[PDB]
């Protein structure tokens, strides 16, 4: 039930599917800071430099491991959790 644990790019702008990064902080979590990607446009930026609604900006999600102060605020004990973070965006053709 419990285990002992020891301790050890301008892509967002340049993208065809650009994204905004929103800082997410919790001092009670490790990592304490995660930046999350939110797709700027619904479509995609083309050669001309405008939103092509033929394509779509989609965020690329990832199930990440995080630690949390369990009991709440207890600074020595932790619980392992799995959160779904969006790292960036890609441009896809519909299905």
């Amino acid at each position, epitope marked *: 039930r419990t285990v002992m644990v020891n*301790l050890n790019s301008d892509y967002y702008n340049r993208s065809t599917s650009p994204w905004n990064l*929103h*800082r997410n*902080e919790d*001092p009670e979590r490790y*990592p*304490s*800071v995660i930046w999350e990607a939110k797709c700027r446009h619904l479509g995609c930026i083309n050669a001309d430099g405008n939103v092509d609604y033929h394509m779509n900006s989609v965020p690329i999600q990832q199930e990440i491991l995080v630690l949390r102060r369990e009991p709440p605020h207890c*600074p020595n004990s932790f619980r392992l959790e799995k959160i779904l973070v969006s790292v960036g965006c890609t441009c896809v053709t519909p299905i």
Partner: antibody, heavy 116, light 108 residues
Framework: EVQLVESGGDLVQPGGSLRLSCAAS????????MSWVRQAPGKGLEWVAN????????YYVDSVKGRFTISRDNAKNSLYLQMNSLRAEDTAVYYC?????????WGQGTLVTVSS | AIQLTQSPSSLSASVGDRVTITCRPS??????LAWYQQKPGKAPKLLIY???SLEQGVPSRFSGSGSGTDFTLTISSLQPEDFATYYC?????????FGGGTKVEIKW
């Protein structure tokens, strides 16, 4: 861009009062925690107060516990600092910042002067 | 509270040098430490979080390290645009505290 703009800071005699005002913009002000850190003339940083998303929890440094009052108006996009019985030690630049533990988003600061 | 002892309080250095600032908390902390840079007339910039993690935008020439009672901020190759006061701050428990700062001054 996220924007934090302080105001209210002015010369006020000791014992007096003043209300700081941090004007937030560029984010869902209602979803994030806020803070106030001070810098006394030629001195280091000193964490002062922080307030929860809604306004249910609030934490302080003991040098301002009972004297200072932190508040928020999530509809207005404003963080406040109602300070009272102002001392010499209370003359600093008051910066407001977003989040609680590691502050990335900082305001420019507001000088509160308290003297004779 | 958890008192942060910063070492040294001031230091002279030249462009290209390797600056090593140390932060030592009064008690024991896991990773709950942050580093900042402050230049005259500006609000502090956050450099490193969780004692070792580089923040968004912060250049590669910055390292953060250590655990428990020994924390290290390191500028491998000093730049002119790097002379400032550096603060360390714990977020282990309230009241949140700052170190006294370290002046990375110019050695004439």
């Amino acid at each position: 861009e996220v924007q934090l703009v302080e105001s209210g800071g002015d010369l006020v005699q000791p014992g007096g009062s003043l209300r700081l005002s941090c004007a937030a913009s560029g984010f869902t002000f209602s979803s994030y925690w806020m803070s106030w850190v001070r810098q006394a003339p030629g001195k280091g940083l000193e964490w002062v107060a922080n307030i929860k998303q809604d306004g249910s929890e609030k934490y302080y440094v003991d040098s301002v516990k009972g004297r200072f009052t932190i508040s928020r108006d999530n509809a207005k996009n404003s963080l406040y600092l109602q300070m009272n019985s102002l001392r010499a030690e209370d003359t600093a630049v008051y910066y407001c910042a977003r989040d609680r533990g590691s502050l990335y988003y900082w305001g420019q600061g507001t000088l509160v002067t308290v003297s004779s | 509270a958890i008192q942060l002892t910063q070492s040294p309080s001031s230091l002279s250095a030249s462009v290209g040098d390797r600056v090593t600032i140390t932060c030592r908390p009064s008690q024991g902390i896991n990773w709950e430490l942050a580093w900042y840079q402050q230049k005259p007339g500006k609000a502090p910039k956050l450099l490193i979080y969780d004692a070792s993690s580089l923040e968004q935008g912060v250049p590669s020439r910055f390292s953060g390290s250590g655990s428990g009672t020994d924390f290290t901020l390191t500028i491998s190759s000093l730049q002119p645009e790097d002379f400032a006061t550096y603060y360390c701050q714990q977020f282990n428990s309230y009241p949140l505290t700052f170190g006294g700062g370290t002046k990375v001054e110019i050695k004439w």
